[PDB]
Amino acid sequence: DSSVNVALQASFDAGPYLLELLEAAAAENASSYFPLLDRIAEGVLDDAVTEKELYDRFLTIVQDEGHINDAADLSSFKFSLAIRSAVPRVEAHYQYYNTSVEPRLGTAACPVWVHMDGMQYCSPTLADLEARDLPFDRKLGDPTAPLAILYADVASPAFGEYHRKLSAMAKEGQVSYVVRYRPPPSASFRPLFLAGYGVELTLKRTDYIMIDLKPLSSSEVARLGMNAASFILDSPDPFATLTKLSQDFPKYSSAVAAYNVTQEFLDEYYANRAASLPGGRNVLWINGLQIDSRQVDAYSLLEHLRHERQFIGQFRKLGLSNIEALDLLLHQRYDWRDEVEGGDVIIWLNDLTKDKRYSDFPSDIDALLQPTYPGQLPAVRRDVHNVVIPIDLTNEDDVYMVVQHIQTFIKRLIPVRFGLVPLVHSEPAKSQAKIARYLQMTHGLAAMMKYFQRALEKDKLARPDQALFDETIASARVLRGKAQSFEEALSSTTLEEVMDKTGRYIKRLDLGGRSPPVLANGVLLGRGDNFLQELSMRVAIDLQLIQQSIVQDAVEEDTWLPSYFLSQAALTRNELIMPQDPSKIRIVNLVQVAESHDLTGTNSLLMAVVGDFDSEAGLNLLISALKFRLAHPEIEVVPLHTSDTHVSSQLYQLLRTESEILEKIQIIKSTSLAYWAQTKQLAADLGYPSGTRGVLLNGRAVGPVPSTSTLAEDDLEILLAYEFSKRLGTVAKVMKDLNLGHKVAGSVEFAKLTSLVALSSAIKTWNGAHSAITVSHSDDASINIVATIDPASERSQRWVPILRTLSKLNGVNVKIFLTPVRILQELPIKRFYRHVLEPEPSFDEHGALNRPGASFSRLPEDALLTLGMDVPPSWLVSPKESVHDLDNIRLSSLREGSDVDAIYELEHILIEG
């Protein structure tokens, strides 16, 4: 008889396997690129291009690189070729060149050439589409005004001597150089078979049902899962047992029914409720770090695996063991009321406790129950819900918001109270605000809108004309009017202290600029995003939290309910430093084996105040920073700056003869070598390019922004406190808590460690006695994969081969906890599975790369089986045509010795939009 085979092919076809080498090379350590290229220019792969000489003459080359000749980097790289994937970047260079370059070119005799500022030549002696920094590019030289874009197929000696001393230009320092590859004649491509997918053969009609010819089993099944583990655990070599067992579960089933489950059936069934607390599910960790079941894929794993080894690899800089380091790694509202200065900044359109729209319905709090959503809360005149909407009366969007439906909710008796702060963030936005304020203050409570109503609509609010002003003063319709001013409302009684009073409330709460958030019971709602239903929802959330309060353990009627929301621990400020709307936390370290290493009280945390001293926010940040160094003497600061004058020059001996003294020097300066060389540069690399500014705190970054004291002292240690946080403070208290005096004594090197932890979690895995198929060294595996694998899940079947492939990677521990199901209510794994995934591209040949595939020999006939595919979410794939129904496969009905050689196709993936 014979079998059933499956392979899978990419729609588009690969170029010379050689490129894929190069791009797989920098896939590991990326700096590898050009240096390889430097020497390969000398063509030590320039003899025959058959894949394995250039392959092995390649490996013997890259093992001349410390970048990729680590212990295991070089294994990761093996994997990446058995891993199909260096081609895609290669494919990019092509798709650009085929669509963006060769079309826009016209007419050729020259086969390789560069883009320089215009045209060029087929000779290396030295225009509507420009030299733009494309995604796949690699810059050689530092990136300035000049760019040299080399187009060439790197494979033939034909190219050879362009680069060699176009490798002589940045070298001296002239034009920035980047290499983009050429596509060959369309006849050069040879095909591309893939891996990292799985092949289903599910039992469509079978006797393998519950109550070689064709399996059976009954309701010894809740057991089937149980037992399946001991079964694996009692074989001499268990991991291998694991593998065959999963592969073809349904046929082995009626066997595994009569083999009861062993002693660490249950000392790990309650020992799962201490360590490793999943029961029967599949989760995966890489160094304790859970992976999600949607990236249990070969690709994902690979680039996670090595954006893990270096991060840790980054620790042996300080000289560490790390059987120690990763058991090292283990162990919302804002105040909205304008009170704080003044007491009538905010303009409240609504007032529950006073507006008569909200009639006379009682305030009984405990009568505040059972709502249908035609009515989220009964009508009760309590202060509960408060929404503060910051507005630019210059912004048209804003006004339309309020004039129609801020106005309607009120009107539709919604028990929510609304208010505005007028943004005073432009010469016109204030004036309107001025105007605005002046109406309810003199010409009372409706004129303003019924100004802004008519101002909004057919006039445009872009600027406030008084022509309109005087017309609505005449109106007092709904209104009326005491405290006259009229005219040009240029009063001093307004110009600043409703204005700075609005002015700082804003800047208190950080609401300047283009679009400021919304205050919904203290929680910020981005107005940029839709929010009106999130408003409607964050209320109905916030509602119950109060109902939760009152129903239970609560206060009586003599308490102000919004206190409840507002009573947290978090006061009154910024969305940048503490950016918990975009949870953008920039951590910046690691990478400082730069051209820096400049060296310049116990352990101490570390702050740099990087600035543009000599200017706006220059000293203003710096003085703010310094009154801060006093307030908090814990840390010594190292300021740095970026400009393009002899007035920051005592900055350069703040104390340099061997500070506080200085902290008054610059305030007496406020009204009146090559340090700089590195500062800005080595600033610009921490963000803070070219003048742009903020401060660092021991790995914590900020950035630059709009005004000059937005980064003030108050801000600095609301920064520190939840910078100190459960982040960088605690680092101190887990010390070498574990022991040694310190290998990280310094405050500079402590600064370093604090970064890495902030890059980060799933706290603990433990109890494996002899109830765990271990598959690696527990020691300084500079990778730890733990994973729990249910012997009888379907999900497990992908997982296992991957693990063998992963485990058979060098320096990649893999350990497996069988965690079967309590009581399998039905038959799990009703299919056959094997997985296409090798850890090195293999050969075994007449000389050419192996096309990865599957092979289904030894299957029960007489009954229908279905071939499906198992593969990443992003993959679209079709099966080519055949005499056989690939859904309907009954090996009986067939002819002997012949079989089914199926080949699916990766037709691109998924472009939608």
Cβ count near 672 (within 10 Å):
5
What is the C-alpha to C-alpha distance for residues 167 and 260, in angstroms, rounded to an integer?
70
Q: Which helix (H) or strand (E) holds 10?
A: strand 4-10
The token duo for 649 is: 């020059």
Which ranges of 350-448 does DSSP label H, i.e. alpha helix?
A: 396-400, 407-411, 427-439, 444-447
**CB-side neighbour CA atoms (13 Å) of 223:** 15
What is the C-alpha to C-alpha distance for residues 388 and 382, in angstroms, rounded to an integer?
17
Taking alpha carbons only, the member of 769, 706, 615, 747 closest to residue 270 is 769
What is the C-alpha to C-alpha distance for residues 704 and 688, in angstroms, rounded to an integer?
7
What is the C-alpha to C-alpha distance for residues 355 and 707, in angstroms, rounded to an integer?
38
Tell me the technique behind this structure: X-ray
DSSP string computed for 135-199: TT--EES--SS-EEEEEE-TTSTTTTHHHHHHTTTTTTTSSEEEEEEPP--TTS-B--B--SEEE
Cβ count near 518 (within 10 Å):
20
Instruction: Give the torsion sign (CA, 610, 616, 619, 620).
Output: negative
3-state SS assignment for residue 286: strand
Cβ count near 331 (within 10 Å):
11
Please state whether 430 falls in left (phi above 0), alpha (psi between -120 and 50) or beta: alpha
Asked if residue 526 lies in contact with residue 390, where contact means CB atoms within 8 angstroms, the answer is no
How does DSSP classify residue 697? E
Which residue, chain included where needed, has tokens 């003294």?
661
**CB-side neighbour CA atoms (13 Å) of 265:** 15
The token duo for 245 is: 């067992």
The number of helices, as runs of H, and strands, as runs of E, in the chain is 28, 24
3-state SS assignment for residue 901: strand
In the chain, the amino acid numbered 647 is V
Taking alpha carbons only, the member of 25, 140, 133, 151 closest to residue 93 is 151
Taking alpha carbons only, the member of 509, 543, 514 closest to residue 336 is 509
What is the C-alpha to C-alpha distance for residues 118 and 107, in angstroms, rounded to an integer?
16
Q: Report the greatest alpha carbon distance in the chain.
A: 105
Long-range contacts of the stretch 445-448 (C-beta < 8 A, 24+) = 445/478, 445/479, 446/477, 446/478, 446/479, 447/472, 447/473, 447/475, 447/476, 447/479, 447/481, 448/347
What is the C-alpha to C-alpha distance for residues 526 and 774, in angstroms, rounded to an integer?
49
Taking alpha carbons only, the member of 339, 237, 202 closest to residue 856 is 202
| Beta strand 865-870 pairing with 813-817 | unpaired
Cβ neighbours of residue 541 under 8 Å, at least 6 residues apart?
none
CATH topology of domain 573-760: Glutaredoxin (3.40.30)
What is the C-alpha to C-alpha distance for residues 86 and 912, in angstroms, rounded to an integer?
24
Cβ neighbours of residue 825 under 8 Å, at least 6 residues apart?
222
What is the C-alpha to C-alpha distance for residues 402 and 380, in angstroms, rounded to an integer?
23
What is the C-alpha to C-alpha distance for residues 756 and 728, in angstroms, rounded to an integer?
10
9: β partners: 193, 905
Which letter, b or e, does each residue of 202-232 get, where b requires 16 or more Cβ atoms within 10 Å of its Cβ?
A: bbeebebeeeeebbebeeebebbbbbbbbbb
Cβ neighbours of residue 117 under 8 Å, at least 6 residues apart?
127, 131
Cβ neighbours of residue 545 under 8 Å, at least 6 residues apart?
564, 565
Asked if residue 728 lies in contact with residue 757, where contact means CB atoms within 8 angstroms, the answer is yes
**CA distances (Å), origin 625, targets 428, 509, 605, 621:** 33, 20, 15, 6
The token duo for 6 is: 């499956």
What is the C-alpha to C-alpha distance for residues 137 and 178, in angstroms, rounded to an integer?
6
Strands (E), 381-493: 386-391, 417-422
Which residue, chain included where needed, has tokens 């000059």?
708
The values of phi and psi at residue 4, to 5°, are -155, 115
CATH topology of domain 338-566: Glutaredoxin (3.40.30)
Give start-end residues of each CATH 3.40.30.10 domain in the chain: 338-566
Cβ neighbours of residue 549 under 8 Å, at least 6 residues apart?
555, 564
The token duo for 302 is: 């690979």
What is the C-alpha to C-alpha distance for residues 237 and 235, in angstroms, rounded to an integer?
6
How does DSSP classify residue 652? G
What is the C-alpha to C-alpha distance for residues 406 and 395, in angstroms, rounded to an integer?
16
End-to-end alpha carbon distance in the chain: 49
What is the C-alpha to C-alpha distance for residues 499 and 511, in angstroms, rounded to an integer?
14
For the chain, after which residues does the C atom lie more than 2.5 Å from the next written residue's N, i.e. where is it broken?
Answer: 107, 126, 211, 331, 600, 644, 658, 672, 760
Burial class (CB in 10 A: 0-12, 13-18, 19+), 51: buried
**CA distances (Å), origin 747, targets 601, 622, 751, 753, 836:** 10, 21, 6, 10, 50
Which ranges of 215-351 does DSSP label H, i.e. alpha helix?
A: 221-234, 238-247, 249-256, 298-313
The token duo for 396 is: 């048209």
Q: Which helix (H) or strand (E) holds 53?
A: helix 51-62
